[PDB]
Write an enzyme that holds these catalytic residues in place. Sequence first.
Site, short mmCIF file in Angstrom:
data_model
loop_
_atom_site.label_atom_id
_atom_site.label_comp_id
_atom_site.label_asym_id
_atom_site.label_seq_id
_atom_site.Cartn_x
_atom_site.Cartn_y
_atom_site.Cartn_z
N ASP A 33 34.26 -16.82 -33.00
CA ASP A 33 35.40 -15.92 -32.86
C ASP A 33 35.06 -14.60 -33.55
OD1 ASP A 33 38.02 -14.64 -33.29
OD2 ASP A 33 38.91 -16.57 -32.82
N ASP A 73 33.16 -19.11 -36.40
CA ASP A 73 31.97 -18.22 -36.35
C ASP A 73 31.92 -17.51 -35.01
OD1 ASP A 73 29.01 -17.92 -35.22
OD2 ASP A 73 28.68 -17.95 -37.38
N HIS A 130 24.43 -24.92 -39.97
CA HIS A 130 23.27 -25.55 -39.33
C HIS A 130 22.77 -26.76 -40.11
CE1 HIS A 130 22.26 -21.55 -37.08
NE2 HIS A 130 23.29 -22.19 -36.57
N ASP A 184 41.10 -13.78 -33.94
CA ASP A 184 42.11 -13.59 -32.90
C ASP A 184 41.98 -14.40 -31.61
OD1 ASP A 184 39.86 -12.49 -31.97
OD2 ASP A 184 40.64 -10.47 -31.60
N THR A 234 35.20 -9.39 -31.19
CA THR A 234 36.12 -8.74 -32.13
C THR A 234 36.03 -9.34 -33.54
OG1 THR A 234 38.03 -10.16 -31.61
CG2 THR A 234 37.71 -8.25 -30.22
N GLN A 250 31.76 -23.72 -36.36
CA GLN A 250 31.09 -23.05 -35.25
C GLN A 250 32.11 -22.28 -34.40
OE1 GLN A 250 29.16 -25.53 -32.26
NE2 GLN A 250 27.45 -24.10 -32.04
N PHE A 280 38.31 -9.54 -35.89
CA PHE A 280 39.52 -10.26 -36.30
C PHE A 280 39.51 -11.71 -35.85
CE2 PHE A 280 40.92 -6.23 -37.45
CZ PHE A 280 40.66 -5.36 -36.41
N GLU A 337 26.74 -24.35 -25.38
CA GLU A 337 25.48 -24.61 -26.21
C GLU A 337 25.34 -26.08 -26.56
OE1 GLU A 337 25.67 -25.24 -29.98
OE2 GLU A 337 23.53 -25.42 -30.43
N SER A 382 39.38 -14.63 -29.72
CA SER A 382 38.64 -13.93 -28.69
C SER A 382 37.64 -14.88 -28.04
CB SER A 382 37.98 -12.67 -29.23
OG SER A 382 37.15 -12.96 -30.34
C1 HEM Z 1 22.99 -26.07 -31.73
C2 HEM Z 1 23.81 -25.34 -32.77
C3 HEM Z 1 24.77 -25.86 -33.53
C4 HEM Z 1 25.29 -27.36 -33.55
C5 HEM Z 1 24.53 -28.44 -33.15
C6 HEM Z 1 25.23 -24.81 -34.36
C7 HEM Z 1 26.15 -24.95 -35.28
C8 HEM Z 1 26.68 -24.02 -36.11
C9 HEM Z 1 27.68 -24.25 -37.21
C10 HEM Z 1 28.34 -25.63 -37.69
C11 HEM Z 1 27.91 -23.03 -37.78
C12 HEM Z 1 28.87 -22.61 -38.98
C13 HEM Z 1 29.66 -23.38 -39.75
C14 HEM Z 1 27.07 -22.08 -37.05
C15 HEM Z 1 27.02 -20.73 -37.34
C16 HEM Z 1 26.23 -19.81 -36.64
N1 HEM Z 1 25.26 -20.10 -35.71
FE1 HEM Z 1 24.77 -21.83 -35.06
N2 HEM Z 1 24.60 -23.67 -34.09
C17 HEM Z 1 23.74 -23.94 -33.13
C18 HEM Z 1 22.89 -23.02 -32.57
C19 HEM Z 1 22.80 -21.64 -32.77
C20 HEM Z 1 21.91 -20.69 -32.09
C21 HEM Z 1 20.90 -20.99 -30.99
C22 HEM Z 1 22.17 -19.50 -32.60
C23 HEM Z 1 21.52 -18.13 -32.27
C24 HEM Z 1 20.40 -17.82 -33.27
C25 HEM Z 1 19.68 -16.50 -33.11
O1 HEM Z 1 19.67 -15.77 -34.17
O2 HEM Z 1 19.08 -16.21 -31.97
C26 HEM Z 1 23.20 -19.72 -33.58
C27 HEM Z 1 23.76 -18.80 -34.34
C28 HEM Z 1 24.76 -18.93 -35.27
C29 HEM Z 1 25.42 -17.78 -35.89
C30 HEM Z 1 25.37 -16.19 -35.79
C31 HEM Z 1 26.07 -15.66 -34.43
C32 HEM Z 1 25.98 -14.18 -34.17
O3 HEM Z 1 26.72 -13.48 -34.84
O4 HEM Z 1 25.16 -13.71 -33.32
C33 HEM Z 1 26.36 -18.39 -36.78
C34 HEM Z 1 27.19 -17.47 -37.62
N3 HEM Z 1 23.55 -20.99 -33.67
N4 HEM Z 1 26.32 -22.69 -36.05
CA LIG Z 2 37.50 -12.35 -32.88
#
Ligand code: HEM
Ligand SMILES: [Ca+2]
Length: 595
Positions: free
Chosen positions: A110, A108, A351, A188, A184, A105, A186, A258, A190
Amino acid sequence: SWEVGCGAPVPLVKCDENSPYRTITGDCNNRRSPALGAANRALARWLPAEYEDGLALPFGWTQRKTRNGFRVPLAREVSNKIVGYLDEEGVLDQNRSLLFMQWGQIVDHDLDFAPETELGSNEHSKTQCEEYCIQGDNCFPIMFPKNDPKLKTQGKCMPFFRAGFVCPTPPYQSLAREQINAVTSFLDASLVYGSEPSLASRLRNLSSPLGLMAVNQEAWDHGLAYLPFNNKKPSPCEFINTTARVPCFLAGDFRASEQILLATAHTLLLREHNRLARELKKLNPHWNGEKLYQEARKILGAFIQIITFRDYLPIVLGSEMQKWIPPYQGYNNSVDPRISNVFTFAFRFGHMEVPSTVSRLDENYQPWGPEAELPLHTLFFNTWRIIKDGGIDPLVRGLLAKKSKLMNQDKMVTSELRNKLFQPTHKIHGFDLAAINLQRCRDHGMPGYNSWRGFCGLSQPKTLKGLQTVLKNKILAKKLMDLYKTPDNIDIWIGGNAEPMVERGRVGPLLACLLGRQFQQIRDGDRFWWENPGVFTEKQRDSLQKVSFSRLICDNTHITKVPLHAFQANNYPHDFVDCSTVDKLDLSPWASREN
Ligand code: HEM
Ligand SMILES: [Ca+2]
Ligand SMILES: *[C@@H]1O[C@H](CO)[C@@H](O[C@@H]2O[C@H](CO)[C@@H](O[C@H]3O[C@H](CO)[C@@H](O)[C@H](O)[C@@H]3O)[C@H](O)[C@H]2NC(C)=O)[C@H](O)[C@H]1NC(C)=O
Ligand SMILES: *[C@@H]1O[C@H](CO)[C@@H](O[C@@H]2O[C@H](CO)[C@@H](O[C@H]3O[C@H](CO)[C@@H](O)[C@H](O)[C@@H]3O)[C@H](O)[C@H]2NC(C)=O)[C@H](O)[C@H]1NC(C)=O
Ligand SMILES: *[C@@H]1O[C@H](CO)[C@@H](O[C@@H]2O[C@H](CO)[C@@H](O)[C@H](O)[C@H]2NC(C)=O)[C@H](O)[C@H]1NC(C)=O
Ligand SMILES: *[C@@H]1O[C@H](CO)[C@@H](O[C@@H]2O[C@H](CO)[C@@H](O)[C@H](O)[C@H]2NC(C)=O)[C@H](O)[C@H]1NC(C)=O
């Protein structure tokens, strides 16, 4: 034509072009094309977008237009029939700590953030959407299917707002809709420092010239720092307990609070920047605040990159790791470093790795108090359990001694996330993250499952027996066929996560491909990648390869016993060693002699 013209709201600046430091926004990394990988730009498209009207409308918008001849199933119905389960017994990953889920998370956050559209502060559309489930403009409600128990108790739908896009955020019209990535591309750090000029400055402590980050002035964890509280009200973190009134934390990324373990991870990194900055001041008394900040910043970003590529990716990708990610050969200026739209859904495999409870362990790693184990849903946007109930050490121990959930075809996403998710903008613990993921796939114009199978050069099943063979599961394939009526229509999020895992990994073939390619690109297309000659000196790099998450814990918490390999499942006390046995990061290579 192509049109590299449209760029509107971006945070452009001039490139110093001999600065040894990254910019905050990501601009200037690539010399020939300065905005490549910068924040507030569109997510890249590896394949053309697929919308109902070819331009902006998601499939499922017009309950009158089909996808390949069939109606797409309701996001929440797919969630109910395929993603849910009741029995949490036997669901845990026997060889992955909770930290394995938590680091994902962090990486992700970052890399990508596609914010929901706003156009609303003193708006009634945020009510017309929530209150009446009227679809229109940016409101694209998740409707409940017949016989859904939430109908009896919550309403007719779950509100859902479309993701922001480039060129406006008003209506707009012309070319296909491209979503924004507000951070960003990268790796990094952020998420610690911010992706914007504003925010990054606000996070810093500019009262003293020591290059430190601002810390909480209302609360301390045994003399150790807490992130500062966020300014804004209404605060989601105080709504969840109006008696404690503890606000959300302020960090480089907006999702920091969150869930409690994410805020915990953020606190460790904030502490590490300050630890670094004062150790650098000891060695270089003449350096000013800015130099201390940037130099501390550069080291922390190198740490994220190292843990991610050396320790984390090999155990996500497994035997597919070498296939997608070659040994590093140097910086390639022709490689596209931008995060792709599909990656933001591929990385959501995490998730299915989130377990239903979180534990606080005491110093002998034993249950901390009467209410040691808490249901996950009580911890979304919960900061009071940290400030008012023990600090972060009890939570950090649980991260080390407890396990992640194992992705399982019959048990995909826990109910804590599938029926009880809390959303910042709303008041109930009643959302569904799985249904939201599916609805978001459509919102983002995602091509279907077989389109991505082709892209990765894997077979494309067209029949029930085809899917069966690929998924190696009869019942799952059949449920998927009865809802989608063609593997071509299966949303990428569920299709990718339904495949059996590769040897020694935790994702299937399709995902290994999408994840692997993306990570190869942000490494190869990053001018400041830590191993890129000239970024650090040979002696500095030599010191950097000894970093470990274990050491990070030892230096920034009052925990004295940690495991050597924090991502695998570790049993206490056998797998735990004393902190003084763990390799320290030697910072003498950073010493800067005058004459
Ligand atoms: C609560 C949430 C988590 C833990 C209890 C949780 C966990 C993760 C992990 C372990 C991920 C990757 C290994 C991961 C990736 C991404 N999440 Fe998720 N996450 C929780 C809750 C949310 C919520 C709410 C969102 C937003 C969903 C939406 O589409 O409105 C969410 C997103 C993401 C996401 C994309 C981020 C982006 O680029 O906007 C992952 C790549 N997570 N989470
Ligand atoms: Ca970044
Ligand atoms: C549970 O997960 C463990 C981590 O994935 C796994 O142990 C790892 O297996 C690798 C195999 O490649 C071993 O690794 C290393 O090999 C040489 C050393 O000779 C090194 O130069 C490389 O860095 C390479 O990583 C390790 O022994 C081990 N890795 C770690 C960090 O512990 C376990 O085997 C898994 N347990 C079971 C029963 O499946
Ligand atoms: C909202 O946040 C409150 C904390 O700010 C929390 O109340 C706290 O929780 C327990 C009571 O349930 C108490 O902890 C222990 O306190 C004494 C020792 O000092 C013990 O004797 C008690 O038995 C108890 O174990 C806290 O004192 C209490 N704090 C206060 C000021 O009431 C609420 O539980 C939270 N409410 C919700 C709905 O989450
Ligand atoms: C910015 O840095 C200063 C200086 O390090 C912090 O002030 C110190 O705070 C500690 C703990 O509150 C106190 O023991 C000292 O009184 C302060 N030392 C000095 C030299 O002033 C200050 O708290 C930081 N500000 C923020 C917002 O993080
Ligand atoms: C750096 O990466 C670029 C971009 O991915 C690579 O460029 C390829 O160049 C080869 C010629 O050797 C062609 O086959 C391809 O058309 C290019 N590939 C693609 C997908 O664009 C290249 O591998 C790397 N360049 C160097 C000099 O190492």
